Structure formats: C-alpha cells, structure tokens
Ligand binder design. Structure first.
Ligand SMILES: [Cu+]
Ligand SMILES: [Cu+]
Ligand SMILES: [Zn+2]
Ligand SMILES: [Zn+2]
Lengths: 153, 153
C-alpha cells in the first residue's frame, strides 16, 4: 500500500492515531500522528510482529524482526525492522510523532501492514543498556497502547 | 501469512474474534470464530477496503473490491472480494462462524491483511434486491462492530 494507519488503544488512557505514507515502492516511509495520555518524556515506539489483538497488546508478540538481528535504535544498522526508537511526550502528555524510516515498508517482505504498532511505558534504551534485555526490547517495558496497522485511503 | 485474525469491536455490545487460515498460497481461506451481542437473525458480514478505524467502523470505507464489481453473495459469480454473506445469530445473540471462501486470500491482489472485517446491523440481501443499493452493500445497513485483519502467524 501507499498509505496506512494505526489507531492506538490500550487498557489505560493512552490513545492516538499514527499515519504511514510511502509514495514509492520500498522507499522511505513517513510516520506521523499524535498520542495522548502519556507521561512526559521518551517512550518506546515499535512495530511488533503480529497484528493479533486477541489478548490485548501482548498477543502482538516481539518486535518485527525478519532479518533476525538484535534490538537497536532506528539509526543503527543492527536493529529489528520494527525498531522506531522513541517518541517524546510533552508536559501535557502528548507526543506529536514525525518520523521517517527506510527500513520498515508498506509492501514487500518488510511490510508492516497487518502488524502492530506499540507505544511503551518506558524509554527504549536503543540497545545501549547495561543488561541482556537491552538488545531484545530496549527495556521499553509495558505496552500502553497498540493498534493493527491497516491499509488507508 | 498463513494465518490472520480480527477482533471485532464497536460502539455497542457486539464483540467477537474471527480467525483466518490459508494452508496454501492459492488454497481456500477458512474463516471461523464467534460474535456476541447480536440480535437473533441474519447479519451482513464482509471485508471492507480500509483497515482504518479512526472514526469507528465508518472509516473502513466500502466493501473490499479491487476491480469495481457489483455486490453479491459469497457463492455468486459476481461479487466483491470482501463479500462473505451473512452470519446467523441465535436466540442468545451469538453467531458461530464457520466458513470457507475461495475469493478472499491472505496474500496478493485479494489479500485481506490490513483491511477491515465488519458485521452489520441488518441482513445482506446478497445483491438480489430490486434497487441499486443492493448491488453495492446488499442493504446490510450500519456497522455494529469491526476489526482490522492482522497477521497471526
Ligand atoms: Cu515495542
Ligand atoms: Cu460490510
Ligand atoms: Zn527491537
Ligand atoms: Zn459487497
């Protein structure tokens, strides 16, 4: 697809909508929108493997990682396809998202269509944490809200 | 991939989980699950074009229909790719779904991944009505619940 969207919802107050736009086949993807109900500061932001909400955000599984690499930051070559780093919530709890990423795609093998976008309770340490979990989930913690990434008009 | 799922939710009490499975790339898609909170009787059941729930089920757009065909029943030669007919709710308001379809798919042009599954207010007349609306929506009316179809395996 050329456009996609994810409506983020969870068990708490965190909610928002994130838009995806890819004007060219396997070209860069623009990711923008807003998320509210967050705590001021950095919050993990990734595309998880499954667009399965049968058990809330937990059934989405791990970060989308078709190349079987370690967790990293979006600017790192060693990263999961779904690693979009962190979004920043303002003092009002609102995170206005404006990202551009060339690893994720809206078509092809790395397509995120039908998968899950998740916003986390804690900051993603981008794999630079002093522990084993850092290179797995960046220690982003609980999934505050999520939504299946669907095709948009 | 070979398995997908949709969690149906709406503004009312209608809720449900519908599973999709396609063993072979060009094999039939098995559709099964349950939907509760429905009024006893027939209720429209289709895959809509957009997996967008920004403004509720209304944002899903029309029936998934790539080449602009007319609406029909799942067994009709002329039908939209997303036309899965009706589900039947029992006296307790539960519709046990167990269908197999040859038109929808989990890959390619007919892929429903990233699109929206919807269950309607009224029965789908399978496009045999003496009016133009029948050839578009089967006159199924409003959308009671819907969910984006995501990759589950
Ligand atoms: Cu995540
Ligand atoms: Cu429909
Ligand atoms: Zn990761
Ligand atoms: Zn139709």
């Amino acid at each position: 697809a050329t456009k996609a969207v994810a409506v983020l919802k969870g068990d708490g107050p965190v909610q928002g909508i994130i838009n995806f736009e890819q004007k060219e086949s396997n070209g860069p993807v623009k990711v923008w929108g807003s998320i509210k109900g967050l705590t001021e500061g950095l919050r993990g932001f990734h595309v998880h493997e499954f667009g399965d909400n049968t058990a809330g955000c937990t059934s989405a599984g791990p970060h989308f990682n078709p190349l079987s690499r370690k967790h990293g930051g979006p600017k790192d070559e060693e990263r999961h396809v779904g690693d979009l780093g962190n979004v920043t919530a303002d003092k009002d709890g609102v995170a206005d998202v404006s990202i551009e990423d060339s690893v994720i795609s809206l078509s092809g093998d790395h397509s995120i269509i039908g998968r899950t976008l998740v916003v986390h309770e804690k900051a993603d340490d981008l794999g630079k944490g002093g522990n084993e979990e850092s290179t797995k989930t960046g220690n982003a913690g609980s999934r505050l809200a999520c939504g299946v990434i669907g095709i948009a008009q």
